[PDB]
C-alpha cells in the first residue's frame, strides 16, 4: 500500500537528518575547493528582488554588494575603484607605482562627483569609499601617510604570506598612528595565521594562497591551500572575533561567489573576472580577438616595472563594462540565494551554520554532467 | 586439493553477501552520477524480446516505454509529440509560444489519425496522449484552460526549482479546477522538495537540476545535484507515496536510461538525445556536418524569443528520425534488462530494492577502460 | 643516536606488516582496474632468463606462455593460430564465417608442419594446439562436430554474457558428447556467473565485460565490470575449483599482463594488441600511416558480414610480426617477474596469495608521473 | 557577542590539533605523489636569505645545496659535474661509455681550477667533488678501480631495481676494497629494499622507480611506486640509520624539491630539469624551437649506443645555463622555506617530524585551481 500524500511533510521527521550534508559534514574528501561541491536548493517563497546582499568588508565598513576588485596593476586604478563603489562594492588601488601616483589615484576616487542608492559612500562626507594596498616595509609608512591624506578609507596589507613580523609590526603601527583607518591583513589560509593577524589588530582578513588564475605560488613554493578549504577553516575561527574575511582568488563565476560566502566569506575579491573590462587599466589589443593583458603581481613583468616569479603574464578577452558585469553578478547572486531559499547574505550565513542549508559533493563525472556537455558546438552567452 | 564442481552453487552460500554492492551500499563516494557505476550482469533465462518496458508516467498514466521528450523549443512540438506517442512514450509540448499557439499544437496531437499496439492512447477515445508544460504565474491559469479544452492529458509545471509557493499554489488550483488532469511537478532534487510537492497534490515529479547537456545552472547558481544521487534520494521518498518520477537531464545513451531506472526513476526525459531528429522543431543547417540548433530554455536566445542565462545555445548533429531512434532505445533497453536478468521494469525495481541486482563503482581508469580506447581511429555507429 | 646498519634486517620485524598492501587490502577504492595500482619490487637473486611462464589454459591444457589471441575476425584465423602456438601460446579461431570455413581453418592449424621447444603441441600427435569459438544455439552443435572432426583441442563458448541457460545447456551437451574436448565458458565478471558455469562443467572461464578496446557494452547496456576487479573476484572463487581463467579485454602492455596474473588470472587474451600484426587477417591500408581494421564482433560491420551495436569499427597501426611481438611480451614478462622477485607464474600466484607480494594504489597524479611526462616530444619505441 | 582580539592566540589552544594534517596523517588517500598535496604556510620572522640549504648526500658527504644531476648520457658529463659542484651540489657522471672515457671525465672534474664559498669541494685537497655511476657486474670492478684512481668521491650503483644479490655483493666488495669511497645504492622504493641495501653497507640510497619523465618501467613492468609515497616510506626507515636518501625522478619544479625534502629526502636528483641546459651533453638542434635530446638510459637508443625498452627518447626545450638555473632553484627553495617558516633544511626535517609543519591534500579541482587557469593565453617565465 502507498502512503497518503497528506502525510508527506510529516514523514520527513522519520529521517535522522535532512537530505544532503551540513557544511561540517562537507568540510571534514579533504583538500576541496569550490568546484568539488554544490549547494542544494531549498524552498522559494519570495522573489529574487527581495534578496539583500549587504556584506561586511571590515569591522566598521559594510557594503551593499560583496564585490571587491583586486589590487593589481591590470585590474584596479581610479576608474575601477570609482565604478566599483558606484555599483555597491569597492576597489583596492594597487601599489605598483610611486606613492605620489597612488595618492593621486585615491584622491581621484575621493573627489568624484556624478548616483544609485546602493553606492558605497562614507556616512559623513558621502564621498565614494576607496581602498588601497601597501607593502609592509618601512618606506610604506610614508606611502600610507600620503594615502591617508588623500582620504583613504581602508588599507590592504599586500602579501602572499601575511603572517610575518613585518606585517604584524605594520598593523600595530597603523592602529596606533591612524586609529580611524580600517586595516585588512593577509593573505592567510590557516587558522594560526588568522589568529596572529587578528591578535595584531586586523579589522579584516584576506584569504587565499595560490588560487589566483595567474598565480603559480603552489607550484614554485609548494605552499598554499585549496581555496574552499582555506575559506572554511579561516572563517570558522575569524568569524568568532567578528573579523570579516575576503575570499580572494579562484573566483570565475557567480557560483564561486555563492560558495565562498556559504563557506564563511563575507566578501569576494576578483582579479581575472574584472581584468579585460573597460574600467580596468591597460589598453585593448587584438589577436582575431580583442584582449587585455592580465598579469600576476609576482610575474617578472610586474616586478620589473635572480628573481623568482610567483605569477605569470597572460591575456584575457574583452568583457565589456563593469556597468553591465557587476549588475549581472548582483542579480545572479540574488537568484542563487532565491534557489537556496535565503533572503539575505546574513540569513545565508545563519542557515549554513545551523545546518539548514545542505550541500553535496560532486565526483568528476558529476562535474562534467554539471557543465555543458555533448554538444557539437555552443556559445556561452552569460547575460544580455 | 580442489573443490568438486558439483558443489559450486552450494559454495556461494559460504559468502556473507552477493558479489558487488547493493544499491544502498552504492548510494551511501558521495555525489555520484550515472557514469560513476555499473550494474553487474545476472542470469539469462529468457529472450530479450520477452522484456516488458511498461512504465508509470504519473499516478494514473502508464506508458509502454519509459521515454519522455523534453518541453523545449528545439525538442518538442506537435510532430515530436505525435511520434513519441505512436512509439509508446509521450511528448511534453513546450510553452515558449503564445497560449493559442500551444493549444493548437496540443489539438494537432489529439486529432491525429493514421498504429502499433504499443501506441500511447487514451483508454476512452483512443486518441494519442499529449503532455504540455506551463509556468506557474497567474496568466498560466488561462493558458492551462485553453490546453485542457484542446484535450491535454498531462501538464508539467516547468521550473528549474519547483519547490516554490507559486508552484504549490498552482498544483492546488489545478487539482481543484481540473480534477481529471494529471500534474507533474518539479524540477526537484531533494527529499524535502519532493515532500512539499507531493503534499500539494502532484501526480508525478520531474527530477533534475543542472544535469542538462545545455544547462549551466550549477555554474551560475551553485545550486543543483548530481543526477544519479538526485534520482536515488528523491525516489526513495516519492516511491513510498506511489508518485512516479521522471529522471530529467544528463541522459545520453541507453545505459543512462537503465541506470536512471535502477536508481528509482519510472521514466526518463530527453532533450539533447532527441534534438537533431527529423521530428524536432527547427530546420537543419550545414557546417561539413548537418546540424540543428539545440538550446537551453534559460539561454538568452530562448528567453528573448540584466538577464542571467542558465543555459546555452548550441548545435547537435543530425540524428535521423525517431522512427528508428526510439526503437533502438527500446530494443537496447530490452537487451540491457536481459543482461541484468530481469524481464520487466517492474521486476527491475523489485530486484534492485531487494538487493538481488548488484552494482559496482568505476574509478576514472575503469571509465576509460569501459569506453573505446587505444585505437588510431574509429566510427561509433550505434545501430543499423 | 642512529641505529647500527648491522641491525637493519632485524629491525623490519618491529613493523606490524610488510610495506605496501596485500592483494586483499588492495581489492577491498572499489571498482579498480589495472592502471589504478602497481606491484612493488622484491628481491632479485636470479636472472630473468630463469623465469618460467607456464600457464594453465584449462583443467587439462597447459601452455608455455600465458598468451591467447582473441576469437575476432580481425585478430585470429589460421595464420595467427599457427604462429601463436609455435610461440608457446594459443589462438582461438573466430566463428564469423561458415562452419565449413571455420573447420578448414582449424584443419590448417592441425596439419601444419615446419620448431622451438616451447611450441604448444598435443602430447600424443605433436600437432599444434588449436582453439575455436562457437555460439550456443542449436546450429552450433553441428558446427562443433565439424570442428572436432578437424582436430579441435579447445572450444570457447563466445558470449558477452555467458551466464545463460543456452550456454549452460551447451556446456552439458559438449561434456556428454565430446568428453575429451576442453570447454572454456563465458564471458563472466561475477562470482555467481562463475559458479553457474563451473557447476555446468566448464574447464576454464573467460573473464571480462566491457573492457575491450573496441567494446561499448558498458555504455549501451550499463552492464559490465572493471577488469581488475572482475579478475580478482571471479578467480578468488574459480581458483578454488581448479578452473583456470582467461583475463580477456583491456590489456595493452606487459604491465597489464603482470597485473592480470597477480589478480588471479591464469592466461590473458588479447585482441587489440594483436590486431595490426602481420599474422592477423585483413589487409593493410594507408592513411600517412599503415593501418589495419580492428572491429568489435558486436559492431554493425561484423554483425552484417534494429541492430543494437555493442562494439565499434576502427583502425590500429601496423605492429609488425608476432614473431617479434610475442617474444617481446615473453621477455618483458620475465623481467617483470624478476623485478617482483618471483621465478615462475606459479610462484607469483603463491606469493600474492600469501601476502608476500605487495601492491600500491596510484592516484591520478601518480599515474601521470608513472607515464611519460614533461617532454617537448618523444618516440615510444618498445623493443628493437 | 564576539571574542576579544586580544584572546585570539590563546583561543588556538581550544582546538584538538593544529590546522591541516601532520605528515603521518597525510601519508596514511594511498598512492600519493607530490602534486597530490601542499605544505601549509607558517610564521615568517626572518628573511629568505637566512635560509641554509645544507644537505647530506651520504653518511660522510654534505653539500651546500640539495641538488644532484642524474647519471644519464644526456644530462651529466664533466661540464655538468664541474658546474654543479661550483654551485653547491654535485654531478653523477654516467657510465654509457668505456671505463677509460668515464675515468677521463672524472679526472677533468677533479683537476678543474678556476670560486664561490658554497662550492662542493673536498676538505683536504679543495678539489671539486665528483660522483659517478657504475653497474654491478664483474667488469664494473675494474671500471671502479679506474674511477677511484681518477679521484672519484662517491659511486652510485645504477639500477632500476637495486635490491639484488649482484648489487649487495658489489656494495660489500667496495666497502672492503675502497673503504674511503662513499657508496650510494639503489634504486629502491620499499622499506624492505632499503633494509637490504643498508645492511650491505650503503652510505646513501637512491629512491625512485618509474617516476622519471622519460621512464616507462611502471607501464612495461607493472612495478614501481608513486614517488612521494616511496620517499616517505623509505626514508622513515633509512633516516633511523642515518642513511641519507636521494629523491630521484619526477621532479619538475621548486615545489617538488620542497615536497621531496618534507617527505624525508636529504637531496633531490634531476634529469629532465637539467637536460637541455648549456652544460648538459649533446648538441642543440631546431624544430621553430631550440631543443636537445633527452632519453632514458633504458631507451633502445641508449642501450644500442629482443631488447625490452624501459625508457623513451625525446626532446626538451633549451633551458639556458645552469649558472642561472641552479641559483633560481636555490633562491626559490629559500623562499619556500621562508613561507613555511623554517630557517634550514635540518629545521624543516625536525619540524615536519614533530608535527609543527602541516599539510593539505589537493583534489583534482584544487590542483587545477592551483595551476594557471582561465586565461586566453599566457607566458610562464620562471625567473629573470
Ligand atoms: N514562489 C514564488 N516564486 C516567485 C516569486 N517571485 C518570483 N518567483 C518566480 O521565480 C522565478 C524568478 O523570477 P524573479 O524572482 O527573477 O522575478 C520566476 O519564475 C518567478 O515566477 C515569489 O514571491 N514566490
Ligand atoms: N601568489 C600570487 N598571488 C597573486 C599574484 N598576483 C595576484 N595574486 C593573487 O591573485 C588574486 C587574483 O586571482 P583571480 O581573481 O585572478 O583568480 C589576487 O587578488 C591576489 O590574491 C602573484 O603573482 N602571485
Ligand atoms: N539462455 C538464453 N539465451 C537466449 C534466449 N533468447 C535469446 N538468447 C540469446 O541472447 C542473445 C540475444 O538474442 P536476442 O535475445 O536479441 O534474440 C543471443 O545470443 C541469443 O542466442 C533464451 O531464451 N535463453
Ligand atoms: N537549468 C536549466 N535547465 C534546463 C535548461 N533548458 C533545459 N533544461 C533542462 O535540461 C533538460 C534536458 O537535458 P538533456 O537531455 O539535454 O541533458 C530539460 O528537460 C530540462 O530539465 C536551461 O536553460 N537551464
Ligand atoms: N642479483 C642478480 N642480478 C642479475 C642476475 N642475472 C641478471 N641480473 C641483472 O638483472 C638485470 C637484467 O639482466 P637479464 O636478467 O636480462 O640478463 C641486469 O642488470 C643483470 O646484471 C642474477 O642472477 N642476480
Ligand atoms: N561487448 C563486446 N565485447 C567485445 C566485442 N568484440 C570483442 N569483444 C571483447 O573484446 C576483447 C578484446 O579486447 P581488447 O584486447 O581489444 O581490449 C575480446 O576478446 C572480447 O572479449 C564487441 O563488439 N562487444
Ligand atoms: N617578517 C619579515 N619579513 C621579511 C623579512 N625579510 C624579508 N621579508 C619579506 O619577505 C619578502 C621576501 O623578501 P626577501 O626575503 O626575498 O628579501 C619581502 O616582502 C620582504 O619584505 C624579515 O626578516 N621578517
Ligand atoms: N626505469 C627507468 N628509469 C630511468 C631511465 N632513464 C633514467 N631513469 C631514471 O629517471 C631519473 C630522471 O627522472 P626525471 O628527473 O627526468 O624525472 C633518473 O635519475 C633515473 O632514476 C630509464 O630508461 N628507465
Ligand atoms: K549541465
Ligand atoms: K571498452
Ligand atoms: K614515468
Ligand atoms: K593558481
Author numbering:
A (entry chain A), B (entry chain A), C (entry chain A), D (entry chain A): 2 to 29, 33 to 118, 234 to 406, 408 to 425, 444 to 522
Task: Quote the original article.
The enzyme IMP dehydrogenase (IMPDH, EC 1.1.1.205) catalyses the oxidative reaction of IMP to xanthosine 5′-monophosphate (XMP), which is subsequently converted to guanosine-5′-monophosphate (GMP) in a reaction catalysed by the enzyme GMP synthase. The reaction catalysed by the IMPDH represents the rate-limiting step in guanine nucleotide biosynthesis and hence IMPDH is an essential enzyme that controls the cellular pool of guanine nucleotides, playing crucial roles in functions such as the immune response or cell proliferation. IMPDH forms tetramers in solution, each monomer consisting of a catalytic and a regulatory domain. The regulatory part, ∼120 amino acids long, is inserted within a loop of the catalytic domain and is composed of two repeats of the cystathionine β-synthase (CBS) domain, constituting a CBS pair or Bateman domain8.
Attempts to crystallize full-length wild-type AgIMPDH in complex with GMP were unsuccessful. However, we obtained crystals of the ΔBateman deletion mutant, in the presence of 10 mM GMP, which diffracted up to 1.25 Å resolution. GMP adopts a conformation identical to that of the substrate, thus confirming a pure competitive inhibition mechanism. Analysis of the enzyme kinetic curves revealed that GMP is a competitive inhibitor with respect to IMP, with Ki=600±100 μM, whereas GDP and GTP do not compete either with IMP or with NAD+, that is, they are mixed-type (allosteric) inhibitors of AgIMPDH, with Ki=210±40 and 160±40 μM, for GDP and GTP, respectively. We further observed that GTP and GDP might bind to the Bateman domain, because the enzymatic activity of a mutant lacking this domain (ΔBateman) was not significantly affected either by GDP or by GTP, in contrast to GMP that inhibited the wild-type and ΔBateman enzymes in a similar manner. ΔBateman and AgIMPDH displayed similar catalytic efficiencies, corroborating previous reports showing that the Bateman domain of IMPDHs is dispensable for catalytic activity. The association of AgIMPDH tetramers change neither the structure nor the accessibility of the substrate to the active site significantly, as the tetramers of ΔBateman-GMP perfectly superimpose over AgIMPDH-GDP.
